[PDB]
Design an enzyme around this catalytic site. Structure first.
Site, short mmCIF file in Angstrom:
data_model
loop_
_atom_site.label_atom_id
_atom_site.label_comp_id
_atom_site.label_asym_id
_atom_site.label_seq_id
_atom_site.Cartn_x
_atom_site.Cartn_y
_atom_site.Cartn_z
N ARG A 73 -31.66 8.38 -38.84
CA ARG A 73 -32.39 7.20 -37.89
C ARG A 73 -31.64 6.10 -37.30
NH1 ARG A 73 -35.65 1.85 -39.76
NH2 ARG A 73 -36.50 1.51 -37.78
N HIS A 117 -35.18 -2.46 -32.01
CA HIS A 117 -34.83 -2.77 -33.43
C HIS A 117 -33.99 -4.14 -33.37
CE1 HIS A 117 -33.84 -1.61 -37.95
NE2 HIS A 117 -33.47 -2.88 -37.68
N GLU A 162 -40.28 -3.40 -37.65
CA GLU A 162 -40.71 -4.62 -38.40
C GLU A 162 -41.40 -5.66 -37.65
OE1 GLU A 162 -37.66 -5.65 -40.84
OE2 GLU A 162 -38.11 -3.88 -42.20
N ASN A 289 -40.86 0.19 -44.22
CA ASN A 289 -39.73 -0.25 -44.55
C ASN A 289 -40.28 -1.16 -45.97
OD1 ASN A 289 -38.50 0.99 -42.63
ND2 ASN A 289 -38.07 -1.10 -41.77
N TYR A 291 -38.30 -3.09 -49.53
CA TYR A 291 -37.09 -3.32 -50.44
C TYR A 291 -37.64 -4.10 -51.56
CZ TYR A 291 -34.47 -2.49 -46.12
OH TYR A 291 -33.79 -1.88 -45.04
N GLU A 346 -36.95 2.70 -44.03
CA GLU A 346 -35.76 2.01 -44.72
C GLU A 346 -35.92 1.66 -46.21
OE1 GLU A 346 -35.04 -0.60 -41.00
OE2 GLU A 346 -34.69 -1.61 -42.74
#
Ligand SMILES: OC[C@H]1O[C@@H](O)[C@H](O)[C@@H](O)[C@@H]1O
Length: 439
Positions: A73, A117, A162, A289, A291, A346
């Site tokens: 990606r 992005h 995002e 995504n 984290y 991600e």
């Protein structure tokens, strides 16, 4: 073992890796400008050079091949494609992505391209950027050009990366380009980001490229209340609806949720009669995504929610390491919005990596992060989430936005002085995971 054909990848973005910021007729982006502003970026760093990937992309394609990646990606630098307000296509910029995609296929790596992005061309910003509804039409025109050029060469397209970060960091906090600090703009921006996604998706459907699919990538922070107390539960529910469903609600259900309409009372003023239908037209997949989670408590002060920091276990970004947050996020999206195809576009971690005396970069904490998170993803797949792939953030250490080069997320170490690449232990480990099709 994961399903046969499960897409193991790694991800990057254009401003974070490419460099060559003013080469080949590339126009300035809002991030070229933002990084000239003293004080905005740690160390006064910029993406002027970054990983020099525009020039070094064949080396990076061989590293992808060395790992056995099934998919990669990347994002497309819109300002390489349309440098300026004439809207004319810059053929050298387009050619770079054509060569990159050809090189991916030559190595049996499936391309996933992110159209946006964060590196908006300055000319679009001069025409209002995401405050202007017309930016949605500019984004659809950019999408149409790229999908007409490369659509059946790129099997997976993502419109936005995002959009919540664009809203929060770009317009609420001024942390990221274009550096606005006016929370009242966030609904307007959100709507135009969504509208741009819908119009881009319309362009994609009109072109109907063979074998290709389009979705959108959203970030999420799984919310947990800090206690079992009713007020913490209520604060956590309201924070989830805002933090995690601001975009998903209109994308899937064609309406904004109440938390969003409360946060941005003027949002309905930007909604034209067919916008919610356009925004909610079906996507082929959702990019997730993730984290870290967020831990919430109630507060008496507006807006009645406080995010509680966690000291440990954390990465170098101070982000809590909680792989169960990934399982819970996936299950929640799937229960709330139905079993649609999901790619984890991600997931990864920053640690302070240092080559040893021998030149090796051993990052066991990053291995442990991936082991936990990939395992959580596997459990979500076993429990009915339609997970189709997993992209480690990032293939390369890169420019981490306002942190500059102070944060390393790669599975491949980059010496930014020499551009030497070295596989970290985590890249070696991940190669083994791919080869085993699981942990
Ligand atoms: O911060 C780590 C990563 O966070 C994600 O929100 C972004 O899409 C990446 O560009 C960024 O490098």
């Amino acid at each position: 073992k994961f399903p046969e054909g499960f897409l193991w990848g790694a991800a990057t973005s254009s401003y974070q890796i490419e460099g060559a910021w003013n080469e080949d007729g590339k126009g300035e982006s809002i991030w070229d400008r933002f990084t000239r502003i003293p004080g905005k970026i740690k160390n006064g760093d910029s993406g002027d050079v970054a990983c020099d990937h525009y020039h070094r992309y064949e080396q990076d394609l061989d590293l992808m091949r060395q790992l056995g990646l099934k998919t990669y990606r990347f994002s497309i630098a819109w300002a390489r494609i349309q440098p300026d307000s004439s809207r004319q296509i810059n053929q050298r910029g387009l050619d770079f992505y054509r060569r990159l995609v050809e090189g991916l296929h030559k190595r049996d790596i499936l391309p996933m391209a992110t159209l946006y992005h964060w590196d908006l061309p300055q000319w679009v910003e001069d025409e209002g950027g995401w405050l202007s509804r017309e930016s949605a039409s500019r984004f659809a025109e950019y999408t149409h050009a790229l999908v007409a050029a490369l659509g059946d060469q790129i099997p997976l397209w993502v419109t936005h990366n995002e959009p919540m970060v664009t809203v929060w960091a770009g317009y609420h906090m001024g942390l990221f380009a274009p550096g606005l600090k006016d929370p009242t703009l966030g609904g307007r921006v959100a709507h135009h980001l969504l509208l741009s996604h819908g119009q881009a998706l319309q362009a994609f459907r009109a072109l109907s490229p063979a074998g290709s699919q389009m979705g959108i990538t959203l970030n999420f922070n799984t919310i947990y209340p800090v206690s079992a107390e009713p007020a913490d539960v209520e604060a956590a529910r309201r924070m989830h609806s805002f933090q995690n469903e601001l975009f998903l609600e209109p994308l899937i259900r064609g309406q904004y949720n109440q938390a969003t309409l409360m946060a941005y009372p003027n949002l309905p003023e930007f909604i034209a009669p067919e916008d919610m239908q356009t925004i909610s037209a079906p996507i082929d997949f959702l990019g997730v995504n993730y984290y870290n989670p967020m831990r919430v408590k109630s507060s008496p002060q507006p807006p009645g929610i406080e995010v509680v920091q966690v000291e440990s276990p954390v990465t170098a970004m101070g982000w809590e390491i909680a792989p169960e947050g990934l399982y819970d996020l996936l299950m929640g999206i799937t229960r709330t919005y139905g079993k649609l195809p999901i790619y984890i576009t991600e997931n990864g971690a920053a640690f302070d990596d240092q080559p040893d005396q021998s030149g090796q970069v051993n990052d066991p904490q990053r291995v442990g992060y991936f082991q936990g998170h990939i395992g959580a993803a596997r459990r979500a797949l076993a429990d009915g989430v339609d997970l189709r792939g997993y992209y480690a953030w990032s293939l390369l250490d890169n420019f981490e936005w306002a942190e500059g080069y102070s944060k390393r997320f790669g599975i491949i170490y980059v010496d930014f002085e020499t551009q030497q690449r070295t596989l970290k232990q985590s890249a070696q480990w991940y190669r083994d995971v791919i080869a085993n099709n699981g942990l």
